[PDB]
Amino acid sequence: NDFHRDTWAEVDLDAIYDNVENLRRLLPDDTHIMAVVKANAYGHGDVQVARTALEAGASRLAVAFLDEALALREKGIEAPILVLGASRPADAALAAQQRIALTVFRSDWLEEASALYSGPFPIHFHLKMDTGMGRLGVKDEEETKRIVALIERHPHFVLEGLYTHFATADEVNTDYFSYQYTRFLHMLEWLPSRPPLVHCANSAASLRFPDRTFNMVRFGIAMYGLAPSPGIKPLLPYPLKEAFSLHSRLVHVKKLQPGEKVSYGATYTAQTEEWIGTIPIGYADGWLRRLQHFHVLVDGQKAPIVGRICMDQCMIRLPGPLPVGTKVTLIGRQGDEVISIDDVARHLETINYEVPCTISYRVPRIFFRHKRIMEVRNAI
Amino acid sequence: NDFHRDTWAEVDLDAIYDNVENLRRLLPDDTHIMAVVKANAYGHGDVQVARTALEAGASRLAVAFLDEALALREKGIEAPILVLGASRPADAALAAQQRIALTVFRSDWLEEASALYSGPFPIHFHLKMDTGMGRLGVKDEEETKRIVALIERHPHFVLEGLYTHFATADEVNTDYFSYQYTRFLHMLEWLPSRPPLVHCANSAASLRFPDRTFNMVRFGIAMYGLAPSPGIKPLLPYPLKEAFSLHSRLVHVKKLQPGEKVSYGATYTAQTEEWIGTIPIGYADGWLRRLQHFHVLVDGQKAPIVGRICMDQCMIRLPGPLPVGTKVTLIGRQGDEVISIDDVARHLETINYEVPCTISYRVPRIFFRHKRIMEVRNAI
Numbered sequence A, B: 001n002d003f004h005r006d007t008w009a010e011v012d013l014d015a016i017y018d019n020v021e022n023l024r025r026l027l028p029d030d031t032h033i034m035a036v037v038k039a040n041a042y043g044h045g046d047v048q049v050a051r052t053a054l055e056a057g058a059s060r061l062a063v064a065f066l067d068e069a070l071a072l073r074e075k076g077i078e079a080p081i082l083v084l085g086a087s088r089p090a091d092a093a094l095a096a097q098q099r100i101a102l103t104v105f106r107s108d109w110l111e112e113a114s115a116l117y118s119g120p121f122p123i124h125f126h127l128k129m130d131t132g133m134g135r136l137g138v139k140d141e142e143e144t145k146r147i148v149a150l151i152e153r154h155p156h157f158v159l160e161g162l163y164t165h166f167a168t169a170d171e172v173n174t175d176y177f178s179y180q181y182t183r184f185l186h187m188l189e190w191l192p193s194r195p196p197l198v199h200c201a202n203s204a205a206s207l208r209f210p211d212r213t214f215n216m217v218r219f220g221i222a223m224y225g226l227a228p229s230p231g232i233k234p235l236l237p238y239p240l241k242e243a244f245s246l247h248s249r250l251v252h253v254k255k256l257q258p259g260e261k262v263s264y265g266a267t268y269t270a271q272t273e274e275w276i277g278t279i280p281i282g283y284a285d286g287w288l289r290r291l292q293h294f295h296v297l298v299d300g301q302k303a304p305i306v307g308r309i310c311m312d313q314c315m316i317r318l319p320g321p322l323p324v325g326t327k328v329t330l331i332g333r334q335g336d337e338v339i340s341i342d343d344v345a346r347h348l349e350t351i352n353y354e355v356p357c358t359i360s361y362r363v364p365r366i367f368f369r370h371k372r373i374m375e376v377r378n379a380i
Ligand SMILES: Cc1ncc(COP(=O)(O)O)c(/C=N/[C@H](C)P(=O)(O)O)c1O
Pocket: A036, A084, A165, A201, A202, A203, A204, A218, A219, A220, A221, A222, A228, A353, B282, B309, B310, B311, B312, B313
């Protein structure tokens, strides 16, 4: 694959392999690892990360909705995939044919699907309980038993799993976590029998309480080398390796005289004779306007973004005359300086999760494996 | 195509047609309209908008970088295309061969392109001047003459046009605007002969001063039915039709009891007996976390987004117990109420330009033309 703009993101698959393999070591051998690669693998490349995670010890994959699961199938992934979110009852037949497990949390969904499907492929369901997150999931005993009954009666409906999700597993204080875990324990007792897969842990819960994961963990954010939250950074068992980095290059360099203005609204004014550089990355690339008071790295040094950020490009103050084509690092390391996703996240006033997901389709992903380029993925 | 999740964007091509046709009527017969279609047509869909704009009176298209132009060419667009940003000297042959015009602003670029390209296709260049935007462009007299000379000197290099871009055309205060306009008229005198295409106006300048735009207008934001700024709004010659809308559907509804918490960090607590709905859209779709206290439309009413916004889902407080499947409008009209892109931008503390651009590849675009569904574009 090829690209024609000097702006690209690099995904270190070696880092991903290490993050997942260290988990495989940490957890009891009888506990499976389900790698969650929804949202195009948190913006890292769905199939590339999936292949890698499976190599390091993961046995299943998780995605947000049906289209994401179907896309993985079309790209050659044959491992089991669980759809974590909602789906259309009418699509049960397509999920069954492609061997995609579904999440179920209401009986009227199953009523509707029983009438539209009748073999020959079995559909594997994972019953979702709401133990305190308030998103999706059952909350009553009568509804839980109704769902199980409706699944029990249809010869092609199978209950493969049962799970819940934590809302504060990344908080040092474990009060709410404890309530949720205990509630899950109580709700499990409402089932006539234990299905083969019982899961509840995300990255934070599995890294902190490996022994309280039952038989399968849904490993996300940490797989990409990002800490669930800064609070538990010191509580992590093994060092995480960040996999994402973003780069660009100077396409224009010029010296301004005192008084000249830069960018939209003419917000910035040079005061001395200064060198301004232009890089081909803007907010349509996910480098949002709120980042106008942040900085990038040029020739091992910090350089401030100057003026307002544009849709496809932005300006920065240079230390002096640098050659056109000089590499600029938005996220990553250059010399002794470094800009991590958490730094960007702080500035955007969000969590690290949102940063790589916002780096758009417009930006090419270059995959590294064994310290060498494996492939380039240019969405457009 | 088709999608398997109930979240989708709607693009009204009839609105886009009208926005362009009105300008076509407002402008002189000699003046061309170059529809700016970069960033996937501001998140609206590149081919669909490019095609509609051409039908409405536009004669040319403008893109941000080479990959965007090649993408249009591969989807059957055969109209002229100008790359507004930078490109590599080594890609000049690719651009020539695909009939793509390139922006030039440095003499060393040409010196390099000359050594690499010898023929046989002619490459049309548009000389960018920097009048006070500080982004891209030539600033001095002898740099301009050196570029012109290098072009004149090459048998396959053609200077088809030259242009500038205004930094404050949307500002009521026209003082910096007139400075740039004056600077441009002056820099035009460094050229021996006035090229066939001279352009300078974006949506703001073309709609405000349609006669002082020379023979080509670069039309962007206004084509999508969005005002360049809130201040310019009552100065525009005709009403703009908003073309982008965003919808989803309730995939879960539940009644929470007081004290119960919702979403990450359990930052929302139900105080009364509230019905809570879960919709399948989140920050990985461009519906950023910052929109947490924003109001969406459900059954003709404003309903607040309660608790933290997740990667693929978020929660809202319902007026009452509505059935699963109920349409929720994030951007658009629901009977009596309307949420415009300007409303979302206000909450995100940004400009309308950024909003549709951020709605990701994950969200399908449904196109309407002649009041009928025309096409469904699903990126994954
Ligand atoms: C049901 C489920 N299991 C596992 C994970 C993996 O969690 P993590 O990346 O912290 O290890 C997630 C992540 N989701 C995002 C965090 P969101 O809720 O925003 O869709 C999840 O929703």
